[PDB]
């Protein structure tokens, strides 16, 4: 079989959202309304591609 292709550690690097779940829960309703577009593009990618490597951007 082939070699499983994996992205480099640098390719995986992003600025994380380092807030707690209570912060996320409190903001969740407004966050869902304001950030719908990029979130829905990401979720369409994940369900169509079925591969996390294909949706890193």
């Amino acid at each position: 079989p082939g070699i499983v292709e994996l992205p480099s550690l640098e390719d995986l690097k992003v600025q994380e959202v380092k807030v707690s779940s209570s912060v996320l829960k409190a903001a969740a309703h407004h966050y869902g309304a304001q950030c719908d577009k990029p979130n829905k593009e990401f979720m369409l990618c994940r369900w169509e591609e079925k591969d996390p490597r294909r949706c890193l951007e």
């Binding site: 979720m43 994940r46 369900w47 591609e49 079925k50 591969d51 996390p52």
Partner: protein
């Protein structure tokens, strides 16, 4: 009965029996191939029906 009727009655009997014998040999050969290769209507052992599969988007993406 005269010899002609019995003679030509024999030929009719022989034709039927010769035809059945050839078909019997052909059926055995056909059965041997179908059972060996599985490409015929016989010895067709069922596999799982693929209409049972659910193609809806699942609770998680990777599947």
């Amino acid at each position: 009965d005269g010899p002609e009727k019995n003679y030509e009655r024999t030929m009719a009997i022989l034709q039927i029996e010769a035809e059945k014998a050839e078909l019997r040999l052909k059926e055995l050969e056909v059965r041997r191939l179908m059972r060996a290769r599985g490409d015929g209507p016989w010895f067709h052992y069922p596999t799982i029906d693929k209409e049972l599969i659910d193609h809806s988007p699942k609770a998680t993406p990777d599947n």
